[PDB]
Structures are given as structure tokens and as C-alpha cells.
């Protein structure tokens, strides 16, 4: 059980088309024959599936010891029905076009599941950042954008890179600075070419913790749904149950704190080295220190090394957040859990899905969970496309206008019950007192994220009941994804051909 990662995501898309194909002909309003309309649907589905562009590079670089190397680099743009196309830049010696093509596809559907205006994209670099000088990573990241930009694969109108595995705000700043100063110098939207930038360079409050909140608001939108918890046989709530984490990195890290702050007791955590198992809870603050002190989660003196993979650890909510294809046909029989959230991108093989549906354990699709990161990188790309600190124009104004609603209510009452002259004191609460001056930059993020992953969780529930998919929310997700991208191709007069 190790399919070509692109043949796998295609496999999910397949079961999606196998169910939509019927409810999609009846919504096609053209005037043709029944079979003809189906010969129209299946055709458009064959256009969605493949990637529309897969660039492939090679970089002469000069390492600090003067020697040269080549660096294969990739970038796919899955679909063009929606511009621009976002997608992270991954640094790993395990990246390939067969991987990038699929990760590129997912973000075409992630962005469709959470209603974000972007096509899919993804860029890889065969590289191990743990090997190279922090000068060499600059000469590599800047060259990698110099190559893309001149071939039309970076720019606020075509593609927007983003952080991903083994990349952070450090790299994303090198990109925005190279693009702004070479190609899009005159363009007013220069700095808006990448997301995940540092705050001082045009970022957004909580771009790092963005994905974590995703995993959080996702789990919350289901744990607090009794219709499934009655099936899974658990309790709506967090402090009553626990969870584990694969891949203590950005997702895994912030998936903890936001899920740790509400009573859910993070049992264990692991990484490429080993596992750290404590059935009583690990402080996400303290462990975060060792990643900056001891280089690994190992040695953590408030837990122990675990002779076994996290995926088999007894818990309540499994969260693979480290790499692809981790759960598989050989790990599925030994999960011993109830819910498998997904921070990583397609961490479950399609073979293991049936086993999970068979074992009666709910799998929440990665299309829905790690989509939080996108919906915040959208606010960033949209922040620095308007050139204004959101809400700055109307801080002093909203603060005044609200002080005149409450006043008018007061002045109005002091004429009806004011016969005694009694000063009715209409004053804000503690909560409203914060929201007087309006929506600050952080407020729309903590809301626009919690809202985007509210509508999405419904549209997934609303579908899985319409088609009776039970706990295969994944298939229900692709259905909502495919139905949306279809109406774009259908009405667009797909081509000039």
C-alpha cells in the first residue's frame, strides 16, 4: 500500500465523480440528450483532474566551499479556473513531480471547499535544509524565484507561494524581496507576491498559528455535532478526551496549544527521531523550549521515549501532521482510536479509508482541516493588496458612532422614564468594550477563520446526508469541491477551442 501520490488523490477524485455525475447532469441546463449531457460531464471531469502546468528546473549554485551543485526544483499549477494560484514551497529530499502534481491538486480543492478564490499550486525543491548554510538557503531561494518569475510562475496575478514543510517566514521574506526588486518593481502589488511573510514585511497576525486554528475549529465543528458522536460513541467536548500529535512542527505545535488550552490532554508527540509518550499531558510551552534548546523533543524529562509509532498509540483523536501516506494498510489495523484528524496533506492511503469506515472511526478530510492556513494566507494576500491596515480608516469613527447609539438609547429613555430625572447609564459591557473601535486586524482573522470553517463544515455535513456517505466525510468533501469547480468550467465556455 504505497500508491503514486498523484494516483491516490486521483483515486479520491474518482469516487467523487462517481457520485456527483448523476446529480450534476440534472443541474446542467443546456439542451442536449441525456447520454450527450453525460458525455459532456465526464469530459469536463477529465479536464479538471490533470495539472495544467508542471515546470521543472535546475539550479547552478555556489556552495560556500566554492563547489557547484544542481538543484532540481518543481512547480505545478493544477487549475486556472481561478487566479491567482496559491501553494506552498516545500524543501525536502523526497519531493518529486509525482508528489507536487498531487499536492497541487489538493489545494485546488482545499480552496474550493473553503470558498477561497485561488487555483491550486505547489512548488518543491530537492534539498535538505538541515545541511546547508543559512547563506546558501538564501542563494537557493532567491535563484528559485528568479527562475520562476521570468517564466510566469510568481506574481500576484499568477501564483502566490506560501510556507510549507521546512520553510518559514524566513524564506518567504527572501522571495518577496527578490521579486519586488527585480521583476515586479513598478507593479504596485509587488510585495503581495507571497504570503506567510513576516509582520514587518506585510504579514498577518497569527499566520504561523493559522493552520493550527484550522485543525482546532475543524475538530470543534465536529466534536460538537452529536449526530456523529452518537455514532462514534463519544462525548461532545474537549476536556473529557485526549489526542496525540505526529510531527511536532508548525501544524503539530500549534495544533497542540489551541487544542491544549481547552482541556484536551495531549498524550504524546513524535518526529523523525522518536516518540514522547505521557498519558497525562505535555506542556506545549515547555516542550517548545527544547526544540530551541535540545534540538529534539527527545530528552524531555517530563515524559519517556516510546518504543512504537504514534499512529498505534491509544488515544481519542489522532492527528498525523508530519508527512504523507503515514497511515496505510499496515497501520490501519492497529489504530486504536476514535477520530483521525488530518493536519498533513493526504496522510491516509485510500486502502486504509475502508478499514477506517469498517472499524467505524471517523476520518476528517485534510481538505477541510488544514484549509485554515489558506484562508488566512488569503487575508494576507488581500491585506497587502489594499495597502491599508484593515480597520484603520474607521477606528475613531466607529468608536464615536457606537457612543451615539448607546447615548441615543439613553437620551430616549430619559424622556419616557426620565420623569424622575434619573440618569439611565447605558454603558458598554466588558466584551463590547473591546469591539467598540471596530474590527482590528487580528479580530477579522480570528473570525474570518472561525467563520470560513463554519460554512465549510456545514456544506460537508449537508452533503454527507444528501448522499448518505455516513462517516466518509472525505468523499463528501470532494463532492462539494467538484460541484464548485464544475460550475466554473461549465459556464466559462471552457475554451476558445
Ligand X SMILES: NC(=O)C1=CN([C@@H]2O[C@H](COP(=O)(O)OP(=O)(O)OC[C@H]3O[C@@H](n4cnc5c(N)ncnc54)[C@H](O)[C@@H]3O)[C@@H](O)[C@H]2O)C=CC1
**Residues tagged active-site:** 122
CA distances from 99 to 93, 126, 466 (A): 12, 12, 33
| Closest among 249, 241, 377 to 318, alpha carbons compared | 241
82: left (phi over 0), alpha (psi -120 to 50) or beta: beta
416 is in an annotated binding site: no
| Residue 442 binding: pick among ligand X, a copy of itself, ligand GTP, none (C-beta 5-8 Å cut-off by kind) | ligand GTP
CA 450-452-458 angle, 5° bins = 100
Q: How many residues bind ligand GTP (CB under 6 A)?
A: 6
Q: How many residues does the chain have?
A: 497
Q: Does the N-terminal peptide bond of residue 84 adopt cis geometry, omega within 30 degrees of 0? A: yes
- What cell numbers appear for 71 in the block? 538543484
Q: Which of 141, 178, 209, 250 binds ligand X (CB under 6 A)?
A: 250
Look up residue 267 and give its DSSP letter: E
Shortest approach of ligand X to residue 280 CB, angstroms? 23
142 is in an annotated binding site: no
Of the two residues 2 and 286, which places its CB atom closer to ligand GTP in the complex? Answer: 286
Q: Which of 161, 218, 350, 373 binds ligand X (CB under 6 A)?
A: 373
Give the span between the Cα atoms of 73 and 53, in whole angstroms: 14
462 is in an annotated binding site: no
Give the span between the Cα atoms of 173 and 191, in whole angstroms: 10
Of the two residues 276 and 464, which places its CB atom closer to ligand X in the complex? Answer: 276
Shortest approach of ligand GTP to residue 435 CB, angstroms? 14
Contacts of 422 (CB under 8 A, 6+ apart): 414
| Residue 209 binding: pick among a copy of itself, ligand GTP, ligand X, none (C-beta 5-8 Å cut-off by kind) | ligand GTP
Binding mask 317-346 for ligand X (x = CB under 6 A): ----xxx-------------------xxx-
53 is in an annotated binding site: no
Give the span between the Cα atoms of 24 and 38, in whole angstroms: 9
Q: Which residue in this structure is represented by grid cell 503581495?
A: 192
| Closest among 355, 333, 335, 270 to 306, alpha carbons compared | 270
Of the two residues 199 and 465, which places its CB atom closer to ligand GTP in the complex? Answer: 199
Shortest approach of ligand X to residue 362 CB, angstroms? 20
Shortest approach of ligand X to residue 335 CB, angstroms? 16
Strand 275-277 and strand 304-306: the pairing is antiparallel
Give the span between the Cα atoms of 212 and 249, in whole angstroms: 11
Contact between 209 and ligand GTP (CB under 6 A)? yes
Of the two residues 329 and 487, which places its CB atom closer to ligand GTP in the complex? Answer: 487
Give the span between the Cα atoms of 148 and 55, in whole angstroms: 9
Contact between 388 and ligand X (CB under 6 A)? yes
Gyration radius of the chain's alpha carbons: 25
Q: How many residues bind ligand X (CB under 6 A)?
A: 40
| Closest among 122, 175, 191, 227 to 381, alpha carbons compared | 191
257 is in an annotated binding site: no
| Residue 181 binding: pick among a copy of itself, ligand GTP, ligand X, none (C-beta 5-8 Å cut-off by kind) | a copy of itself
- What cell numbers appear for 146 in the block? 528568479
- What cell numbers appear for 217 in the block? 475549529
Q: Considering only residues 277-316, where is the footprint of ligand X by CB under 6 A?
A: none
User: How far does the chain reach from its first CA to its final CA, in angstroms?
Assistant: 40
Give the span between the Cα atoms of 239 and 215, in whole angstroms: 16
Give the span between the Cα atoms of 5 and 165, in whole angstroms: 17
Q: Which of 105, 145, 166, 475 binds ligand X (CB under 6 A)?
A: 166
Contact between 456 and ligand X (CB under 6 A)? no
Q: Are 366 and 342 in contact (CB under 8 A)?
A: yes
115 is in an annotated binding site: yes
Contact between 101 and ligand X (CB under 6 A)? no
75 is in an annotated binding site: no
Of the two residues 1 and 398, which places its CB atom closer to a copy of itself in the complex? Answer: 398
Q: Considering only residues 420-449, where is the footprint of ligand GTP by CB under 6 A?
A: 442
Of the two residues 18 and 447, which places its CB atom closer to a copy of itself in the complex? Answer: 447
Q: Are 351 and 1 in contact (CB under 8 A)?
A: yes
Contact between 205 and ligand GTP (CB under 6 A)? yes
291 is in an annotated binding site: no
Name the segment binding ligand GTP (CB under 6 A); options: 29-37, 206-214, 372-380, 407-415.
206-214
Binding site for ligand GTP (CB under 6 A): 205-206, 208-209, 285, 442
Binding site for ligand X (CB under 6 A): 82-83, 111-112, 115-117, 163-166, 191, 200-202, 211, 247, 249-251, 270-272, 321-323, 343-345, 370, 373, 383-384, 387-389, 441, 484-485, 488
List residues forming the annotated binding site for NAD(+). Answer: 80-82, 115, 191, 383
List residues forming the annotated binding site. Answer: 80-82, 86, 110, 115, 191, 205, 209, 258, 261, 377, 383, 389, 455
Amino acid at each position: 500500500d504505497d500508491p503514486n501520490f498523484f494516483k491516490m488523490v486521483e483515486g479520491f477524485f474518482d469516487r467523487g465523480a462517481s457520485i456527483v455525475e448523476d446529480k450534476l447532469v440534472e443541474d446542467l441546463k443546456t439542451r442536449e440528450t441525456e447520454e450527450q449531457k453525460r458525455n459532456r460531464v465526464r469530459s469536463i471531469l477529465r479536464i479538471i483532474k490533470p495539472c495544467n502546468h508542471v515546470l521543472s528546473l535546475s539550479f547552478p549554485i555556489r556552495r560556500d566551499d566554492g563547489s557547484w551543485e544542481v538543484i532540481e526544483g518543481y512547480r505545478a499549477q493544477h487549475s486556472q479556473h481561478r487566479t491567482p494560484c496559491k501553494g506552498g514551497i516545500r524543501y525536502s529530499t523526497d519531493v518529486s513531480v509525482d508528489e507536487v502534481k498531487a499536492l497541487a491538486s489538493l489545494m485546488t480543492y482545499k480552496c474550493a471547499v473553503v470558498d477561497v478564490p485561488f487555483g491550486g499550486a505547489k512548488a518543491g525543491v530537492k534539498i535538505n535544509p538541515k545541511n546547508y548554510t543559512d547563506n546558501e538557503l538564501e542563494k537557493i531561494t532567491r535563484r528559485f524565484t528568479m527562475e520562476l518569475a521570468k517564466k510566469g510562475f510568481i506574481g500576484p496575478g499568477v501564483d502566490v507561494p506560501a510556507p510549507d514543510m521546512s520553510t518559514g517566514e524566513r524564506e518567504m521574506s527572501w522571495i518577496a524581496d527578490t521579486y519586488a526588486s527585480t521583476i515586479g518593481h513598478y507593479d504596485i502589488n509587488a510585495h503581495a507576491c507571497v504570503t506567510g511573510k513576516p509582520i514587518s514585511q506585510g504579514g498577518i497576525h497569527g499566520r504561523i498559528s493559522a493552520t493550527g486554528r484550522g485543525v482546532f475549529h475543524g475538530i470543534e465543528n465536529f466534536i460538537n455535532e452529536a449526530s456523529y458522536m452518537s455514532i462514534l460513541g463519544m462525548t461532545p467536548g474537549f476536556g473529557d478526551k485526549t489526542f496525540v500529535v505526529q510531527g511536532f512542527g508548525n501544524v503539530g505545535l500549534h495544533s497542540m496549544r489551541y487544542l491544549h488550552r481547552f482541556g484536551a490532554k495531549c498524550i504524546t508527540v513524535g518526529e523523525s527521531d522518536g516518540s514522547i509518550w505521557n498519558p497525562d499531558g505535555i506542556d506545549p510551552k515547555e516542550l517548545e523550549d527544547f526544540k530551541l534548546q535540545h534540538g529534539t523533543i527527545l530528552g524531555f524529562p517530563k515524559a519517556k521515549i516510546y518504543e512504537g509509532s504514534i499512529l498505534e498509540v491509544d488515544c481519542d483523536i489522532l492527528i498525523p501532521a508530519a508527512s504523507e501516506k503515514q497511515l496505510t494498510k499496515s497501520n490501519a489495523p492497529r489504530v486504536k482510536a476514535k477520530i483521525i484528524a488530518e493536519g498533513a496533506n493526504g496522510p491516509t492511503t485510500p486502502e486504509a479509508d475502508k478499514i477506517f469506515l469498517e472499524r467505524n472511526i471517523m476520518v476528517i478530510p485534510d481538505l477541510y482541516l488544514n484549509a485554515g492556513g489558506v484562508t488566512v494566507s488569503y487575508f494576507e494576500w488581500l491585506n497587502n493588496l489594499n495597502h491599508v491596515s484593515y480597520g484603520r480608516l474607521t477606528f475613531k469613527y466607529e468608536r464615536d458612532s457606537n457612543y451615539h447609539l448607546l447615548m441615543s438609547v439613553q437620551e430616549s429613555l430619559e424622556r419616557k422614564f426620565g420623569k424622575h430625572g434619573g440618569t439611565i447609564p447605558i454603558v458598554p459591557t466588558a466584551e463590547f468594550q473591546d469591539r467598540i473601535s471596530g474590527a482590528s486586524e487580528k479580530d477579522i482573522v480570528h473570525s474570518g477563520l472561525a467563520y470560513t470553517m463554519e460554512r465549510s463544515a456545514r456544506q460537508i455535513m449537508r452533503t454527507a446526508m444528501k448522499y448518505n456517505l455516513g462517516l466518509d466525510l472525505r468523499t463528501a468533501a470532494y463532492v462539494n469541491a467538484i460541484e464548485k469547480v464544475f460550475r466554473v468550467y461549465n459556464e466559462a465556455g471552457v475554451t476558445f477551442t
